[PDB]
Amino acid sequence: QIKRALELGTVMTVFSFRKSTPERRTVQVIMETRQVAWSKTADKIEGFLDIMEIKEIRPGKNSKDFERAKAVRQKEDCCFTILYGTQFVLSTLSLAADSKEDAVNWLSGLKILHQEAMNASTPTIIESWLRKQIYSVDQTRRNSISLRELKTILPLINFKVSSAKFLKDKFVEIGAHKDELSFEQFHLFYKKLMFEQQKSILDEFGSGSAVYLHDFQRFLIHEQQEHWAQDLNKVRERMTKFIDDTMRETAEPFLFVDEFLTYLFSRENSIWDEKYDAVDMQDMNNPLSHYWISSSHNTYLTGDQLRSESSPEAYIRCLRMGCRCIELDCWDGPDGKPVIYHGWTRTTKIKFDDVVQAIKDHAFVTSSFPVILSIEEHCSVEQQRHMAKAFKEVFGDLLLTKPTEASADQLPSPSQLREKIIIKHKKLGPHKQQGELYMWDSIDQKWTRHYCAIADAKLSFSDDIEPNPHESKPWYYDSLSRGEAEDMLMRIPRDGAFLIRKREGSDSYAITFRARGKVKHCRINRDGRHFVLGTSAYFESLVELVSYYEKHSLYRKMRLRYPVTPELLERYNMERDINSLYDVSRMYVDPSEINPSMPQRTVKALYDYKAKRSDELSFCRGALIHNVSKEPGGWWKGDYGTRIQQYFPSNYVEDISTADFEELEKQIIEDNPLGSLCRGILDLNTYNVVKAPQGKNQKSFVFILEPKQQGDPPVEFATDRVEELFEWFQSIREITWKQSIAIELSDLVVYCKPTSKTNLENPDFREIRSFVETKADSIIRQKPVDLLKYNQKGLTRVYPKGQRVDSSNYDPFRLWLCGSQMVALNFQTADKYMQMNHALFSLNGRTGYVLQPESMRTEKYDPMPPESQRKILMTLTVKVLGARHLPKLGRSIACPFVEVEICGAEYDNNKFKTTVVNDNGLSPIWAPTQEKVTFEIYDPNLAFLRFVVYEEDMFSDPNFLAHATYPIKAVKSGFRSVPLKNGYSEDIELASLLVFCEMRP
């Protein structure tokens, strides 16, 4: 059809906000990889996007590329935008065609090409994936593969080649006529690799020669509990649709046992129950107060709360996920039209008019159910009039302007309010000093950018905002012992301080670095010419290794920054003498003093214990040990005093009581404006501020906090402009020396009238109460039953505390179980709680409304029963058997393990982890190591089954790879695939666990 017109290609004009001049390119669809490619010449493809990653094809000149370009002369009807990607912020390919003909050809042709890809079988996606891989080396659109190029690819696809024999022994077995492998020679290699690596799973299945039509139907009926599989003709179809072999399609289909394993790891065999993919309108006729409503906080932001980009695309992205409650922070614009950003911060400003349009175009595309606009009002009465007018005019009939029923005593249903936009805004009755400053490092002799803020006469500042050639380099030490290195690096008080030394009595090396006032050592061996850090981190050169870990994290979030040289030790030693009269530590804060006390992860010592090893902690009876990570057997890991996560006997501690609570409440860290991002705090009452007449260290604009108190260190800050320095100077000097609503908008508030009324008695259904995270958590703590009863008729919004400046999220489980409707979360953040939110709102067809269960509305509903009165409705047993295509995080091959947990407000860290597989992300296996674990579930409708895949790095630290999180409601039994998602809950190509699950009611 037009698919051939797209496969051939089309010359069009590409626009990037990243490139300043539009570039003419041939745009084509490679059917073999299912990519949209754009090339300058025929030989090489400049750039590509996977069709699988397309979220929207938007006609016109509505993209960041278009609006940032100089002109765009091409017509609206020749212009369109492919919005694609794996993150919250989607990439944009903005295109202008020569003609309206071609443009319309693409929008139609791409839509059907996407659907084909979505609906395609796993074996079709594998061939596309194998096609992508051989293209990737030299980008020629290759036909065959070298032996040396396959050995270069295997580590990139997260597999370590055990030996050279393994490939050649394979090569022969597949048929290695030469070192070259054709595409189908490579295709056959993958299948053999996957089967041989994972064969052992079969010991759980039949002793037949292959899996025949009848064997498979039994498997679907009895072990998978699929009762459609009675209809034997449906079972033969599934087989054939999977296989796709014309010669075997004849008569009765059978899978080869390796094709059966592939099916078990495949989408087709997902743990997810599909009936929950559609809306159920029988669950959409309850009052609005009975629904969990997918809710965003400060929707405009794409990043942190301090300096990240505001975009209308954030509203679009959230709305098209089915988010139904979005936030507009409305501030006085320059031209009497409101702007939206985070007040007083360096977050970019966007126009209210662009957000209103964006909401109108996107509110009701993927979900028909009512959208709630939470308006935080800082605008003038006149600017409020523009908002009242703009809403009415742009939204028209979509804008709820009067109640659904006049004589109502409860809220209307989501059904009744379809394609309605509801204004939450204060209804009429009938200036923090902050920004970016440069700070000076005497060690590095460099300035870095920090976000700083003054709260209650205290300036808080953030962390910074971003042939053996090593023999000449002064960070390399030819003849240095392990003990000296530790002492040398213990002299330099900086995380990321490093040197590389040759190991004593060996032609091999080590990197030793300081992290959190403690030195660590990393072994660097040689593989012929190459250098290997730990196990599989390959480098050509120790300079290349140092370059990489300057840009990429080596240990946790520590990078290499401070090369420990003789010149640095010489300089710092003298400077430490000169600066002896003050203690520099006092301006920085301790990394534990910003880390909160864990809700329930604290133990109390039953006995005195003396450490038999440096590994082990030593403590007295009565000692409270915090942030305990519980593993099986004798030894647990936890923090006591200064030390962190050291080993101790588990049978030497007991649970804390309420009597210990008061002691932990005193130990609760004092919040600062930068929360987790805070690096140091300065008491401006104990300083004078002076401007350096001629700046300092090559900055012109430098102010200095000079200490009043003995021992307190002076602090130097710099600005880009003298005007910044003045505002900071006068803000600091003023410490060191020492409600109108526009009727027009007010009238648009039908429901969701904000109220205060002190406390939760007499809920009005037209009213909404909002609680910051902190207030919400104290209500849950003291008044949970009041919140529940209020939430039956009234609505509740919760939003993150102001300190979550990193755009981190908070536990919504307890709030949800008290019937709280709008638990507003940072959708731009890839963390556990957004993952929970996406899981919950995957139910009921991604409408962003989930009916609270009937159980929550009976008199005998208790979220928190006593231990002895715990009623068990279901047991869930889980075995993690294996995984395919785990992502490669960094430079080394994944050493994966899986953590399984039942998530909810009834569950105190109810998890188990698998053992670690060494250097294999492509095809790990865990089946032989552990038995099933059994979970007791109190209510299946109130809980989530969460799988998280971690890599175990060289330091034994867990790093996130993927997750899958499901309401237990939608979990199927038997040998099930678990399709793995990234931190943003976007699908990772061909990535899946294989698990066994048993649910007994």
Ligand SMILES: [Ca+2]
């Ligand atoms: Ca806000």
